[PDB]
Amino acid sequence: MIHELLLALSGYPGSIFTWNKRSGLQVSQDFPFLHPSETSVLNRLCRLGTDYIRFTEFIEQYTLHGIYLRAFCTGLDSVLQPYRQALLDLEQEFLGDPHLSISHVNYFLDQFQLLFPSVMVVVEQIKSQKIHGCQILETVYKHSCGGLPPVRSALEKILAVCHGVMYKQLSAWM
Amino acid sequence: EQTVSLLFSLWVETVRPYLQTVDEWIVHGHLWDGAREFIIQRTMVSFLKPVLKQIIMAGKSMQLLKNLELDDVHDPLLAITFELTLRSCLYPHIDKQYLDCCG
Amino acid sequence: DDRVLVTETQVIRETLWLLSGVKKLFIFQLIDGKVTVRNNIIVTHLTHSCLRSVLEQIAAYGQVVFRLQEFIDEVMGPFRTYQAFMWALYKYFISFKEELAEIEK
Amino acid sequence: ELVKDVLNVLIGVVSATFSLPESISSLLSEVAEYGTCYTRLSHFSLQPKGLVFQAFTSGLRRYLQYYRACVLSTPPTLSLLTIGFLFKKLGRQLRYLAELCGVAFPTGVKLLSYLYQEALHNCSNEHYPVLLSLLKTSCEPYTRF
């Protein structure tokens, strides 16, 4: 279920890792090939994946309309890249050593555990208040004063791309 | 010593908010607080008491001027007798800055 | 009175999980936010009571790490100070976790 | 190894599992359905009615070959998950080209202007060069007139 886990973390659930459109990723039931008090960490690890899918389900649908919103989407694709990069790194590890345990990935994947919940609610405000127009430039900036250095440096990048639209329309007009 | 290295490394990452607004109040001439977190609600931490007077007298004086990276300095000071005399070398960053504003 | 008669190495693995801050463990079953050793645990040696003694000490350490994990949880799910305080606490845990995780290897 | 199977779907040739644990099928479908539009283009842009429609049809094949050039180039045999991630930032763009064409369709000036309004509608995004290189050659014969 090692390789089964990584695929579930990429957006492809299975039988052992069921999917729900309401709750999200979750362990189905008890299995005899897993420790009785181990299912805990997997559910906590699955919460990292549940955020990831709702990203893609939002990205693919692009849903509200406007260039600033659409360009904010592509800006969201850049920040998720190290998550794609770091997860792929584990593949080289287990192919090398096949006896690794489930504890190591949690020790490796702690940094992304904190970045998503702060940036995920930023999407929720947009889908719940219909933030249309240039006002998206402030909702990203209002959370840009956050305390977490990584969360600050992440939304910093989206702002560096979201302004890429304003500067163009500003230039072609002024 | 290892227990002091922990508390110190735990200290800097918790006083980072105040050192930001304090600097932000100085150079940007306005106090930008959230939920009235700062002690100056526009009951006091003695951490910065020995120089507090030089702050307010620089903050308010700066606001009357516009109408007419501090944390990134304290950390390099650690690179070049702990937290009492060592802390007494932080204020030269907050005092010379003040001297320019009032001057 | 019946007992589970767990093996020896299994305890260390469980102890590492308690150090990690994970919950729902076959040993150290908390009830009211207070980790507490079970009652049917026994090894071939250690006369069933010293085990309740040695685990009781490590349990006292689980309380220190379980409560902190409850604190970090109640911040993730604009104070700008507590949120800036946990990031220091959280940073310490990752490095501490690596030493415990390494031992498991 | 299955990698020479999945990589040979973007080309159009059928395979042992591509006709015309167990969760891999869901992962397989995400790269599978990418292939169904590649074939759905050669069936649509094979001919060499309208003159400007031919150039736009002749400009499209100037692009697909690049898509055929990028594949069969880098990976001899890479990890299965690497394929899905590598062909994501590019694969979704291939599905966007299905919204543009049919897979009715204007002709003449009506098409040379319709494609223009697709530029300002999606300008700043990553779809600016590809649409531009089409418009830059989909108007080539019309300039001659």
Curated annotation (Swiss-Prot), chain A:
Expression sites (tissue/organ): Ubiquitously expressed.
UniProt subcellular location: Cytoplasm, Cytoskeleton, Microtubule organizing center, Centrosome
Quaternary organization: Component of the gamma-tubulin ring complex (gTuRC) consisting of TUBGCP2, TUBGCP3, TUBGCP4, TUBGCP5 and TUBGCP6 and gamma-tubulin TUBG1 or TUBG2. TUBGCP2, TUBGCP3, TUBGCP4, TUBGCP5 and TUBGCP6 assemble in a 5:5:2:1:1 stoichiometry; each is associated with a gamma-tubulin, thereby arranging 14 gamma-tubulins in a helical manner. Gamma-tubulin at the first position is blocked by TUBGCP3 at the last position, allowing 13 protafilaments to grow into a microtubule.
Family as reported in the entry's similarity comment: Belongs to the TUBGCP family.
Function text: Component of the gamma-tubulin ring complex (gTuRC) which mediates microtubule nucleation. The gTuRC regulates the minus-end nucleation of alpha-beta tubulin heterodimers that grow into microtubule protafilaments, a critical step in centrosome duplication and spindle formation.
Disorder: Microcephaly and chorioretinopathy, autosomal recessive, 3: A disorder characterized by congenital microcephaly and chorioretinal dysplasia associated with poor vision and nystagmus. Variable ocular anomalies include microphthalmia, retinal folding, retinal detachment, optic nerve hypoplasia, absence of retinal vessels, round areas of chorioretinal atrophy, and attenuated electroretinogram. Most patients have mild developmental delay and mild learning difficulties.
The protein's name: Gamma-tubulin complex component 4
From Swiss-Prot, chain C:
Protein's recorded name: Gamma-tubulin complex component 5
Physiological role: Component of the gamma-tubulin ring complex (gTuRC) which mediates microtubule nucleation. The gTuRC regulates the minus-end nucleation of alpha-beta tubulin heterodimers that grow into microtubule protafilaments, a critical step in centrosome duplication and spindle formation.
Record-stated family: Belongs to the TUBGCP family.
Localization (cell): Cytoplasm, Cytoskeleton, Microtubule organizing center, Centrosome
Tissue: Widely expressed, with highest levels in heart and skeletal muscle and moderate levels in brain.
Subunit note: Component of the gamma-tubulin ring complex (gTuRC) consisting of TUBGCP2, TUBGCP3, TUBGCP4, TUBGCP5 and TUBGCP6 and gamma-tubulin TUBG1 or TUBG2. TUBGCP2, TUBGCP3, TUBGCP4, TUBGCP5 and TUBGCP6 assemble in a 5:5:2:1:1 stoichiometry; each is associated with a gamma-tubulin, thereby arranging 14 gamma-tubulins in a helical manner. Gamma-tubulin at the first position is blocked by TUBGCP3 at the last position, allowing 13 protafilaments to grow into a microtubule.
Gene encoding the protein: TUBGCP5
Organism: Homo sapiens
From Swiss-Prot, chain D:
Phylogenetic lineage: Eukaryota, Metazoa, Chordata, Craniata, Vertebrata
Subunit field text: Component of the gamma-tubulin ring complex (gTuRC) consisting of TUBGCP2, TUBGCP3, TUBGCP4, TUBGCP5 and TUBGCP6 and gamma-tubulin TUBG1 or TUBG2. TUBGCP2, TUBGCP3, TUBGCP4, TUBGCP5 and TUBGCP6 assemble in a 5:5:2:1:1 stoichiometry; each is associated with a gamma-tubulin, thereby arranging 14 gamma-tubulins in a helical manner. Gamma-tubulin at the first position is blocked by TUBGCP3 at the last position, allowing 13 protafilaments to grow into a microtubule.
Known disease link: Microcephaly and chorioretinopathy, autosomal recessive, 1: A syndrome characterized by microcephaly, cognitive impairment, underdeveloped retina and choroid, and epilepsy in some patients. The more anterior parts of the retina, near the periphery and pars plana, have a grayish hue and diminutive vasculature similar to retinopathy of prematurity. Visual impairment becomes evident during the first year of life.
Subcellular location: Cytoplasm, Cytoskeleton, Microtubule organizing center, Centrosome
Family of the protein in this entry: Belongs to the TUBGCP family.
Function text: Component of the gamma-tubulin ring complex (gTuRC) which mediates microtubule nucleation. The gTuRC regulates the minus-end nucleation of alpha-beta tubulin heterodimers that grow into microtubule protafilaments, a critical step in centrosome duplication and spindle formation.
Name assigned to this protein: Gamma-tubulin complex component 6
